[model samples]
Target: LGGYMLGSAMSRPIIHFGSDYEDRYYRENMHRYPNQVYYRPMDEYSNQNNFVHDCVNITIKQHTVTTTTKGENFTKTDVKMMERVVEQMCITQYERESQAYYQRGSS
Candidate 1:
């Protein structure tokens, strides 16, 4: 969790689609490493501005899995699934918003 936050804040996008460097940086890093970071676009979700919001919902789930007892029989597959879901949600939103922003610019 801490690593995700740190990486999100510090990492740069190895590529860009259309947004500013900062915007692309946050979106790319968050999507590529959603478990380490969470993203919320300000244009649609105004709770924050120009930064990835720590997704408390997903974070809680991750914490739950991490803290669960081994006797509960948790497996790596379970953790991978959770991570995949988080990444998918973040990437889907990133693509949607990136397209919206691009269309708005063209208009």
Candidate 2:
């Protein structure tokens, strides 16, 4: 399947123990909120970027659940997980990409 290959952080780059961004903070990511988005005089409510906002929120919430009632009831829809090692941006961008797929489908 040419779909995608992602199961968990059990692979790819998240931690390296002795890495720069991992061992310490990288100044480029400095922000008031980890999920912050910049706009110049943003609209009160409008088109386009609404998609990004929705996407980012979805990603943050998913990983934000560090615990699960799935085990408590066999229903995984209840809660999730979060940790210091998890990159806030990583989840946001992943959701951002997902929005593109859904955005096209929405029409």
Candidate 3:
């Protein structure tokens, strides 16, 4: 029982360290948000697309995790994890938008 109790509070699940704000930016245009930016440079027209999945845009932004009880701020690890999640979400969104752009190519 004591060992199980230790697991409960001994460590915080960094995986769950996220917020609604993450989802919010995912819907909004990544460029419109000044603070939010694409991880990859989408303006490389000199390059290409489709096969350019590697170049697909993904959001990267400064995260200011809400101050938790007792004035707890986000640890460097927490911010890093947040960035990974944000980047993944952004990439997923860009793929959909890019697909739409492909199907609706023209004007």
Candidate 4:
């Protein structure tokens, strides 16, 4: 682990890499810990709600994955897709938080 320590000691993180998209997801999504000025290769997803779902929950199945029907009405909603949509909503809330900071000094 000596080499890892040596490498970590000398390096730092690059902030705001590209003009958009890939940068928002991969780069600025990271934040350095309070004491460090600027330094890290790994982007840690830190937030007040880390490990928490931070969102609401669900409904019955549509597919034959279960024979059960919703009171004889069929609504073919993809459970996984809906789940991810809400998850992305949670993440997007924070993305807006980051952008809000960028606008902190502006009108």
Q: List, residue by residue over 1-106, the lDDT tens digit for candidate 4.
A: 1111111112223333335763454333222111111111112564525411433131112122232332222233333332333344434444545565556664
C-alpha TM-scores of all predictions: 0.31, 0.25, 0.37, 0.27
What are the runs in model 3 whose C-alpha is more than 4 Å off? Answer: 1-62, 65-72
Model 3 CA lDDT for position 4 = 13
- Give the best candidate by TM-score: 3
Best by lDDT: 1
* lDDT of residue 92 for candidate 1: 41
lDDT of 1 by residue, 62-103 (tens): 545553542333245434443444444445445555666767
Residue 15, model 1: lDDT of: 32
Candidate 4 residue-wise lDDT at 103: 67
Write model 3 residue lDDT over 27-69, tens digit each, in one string.
3422222233233333435233422333222222223422223
lDDT of 4 at 32: 19
Model 4: per-residue Cα lDDT at residue 87 = 41
Prediction 2 TM-score vs. true: 0.25
Clashing pairs in 1: 4-36
TM-score of 4: 0.27
Instruction: Give a tens-digit lDDT track for model 2, residues 9-53.
Output: 322223334357433432232221123222121234434456344
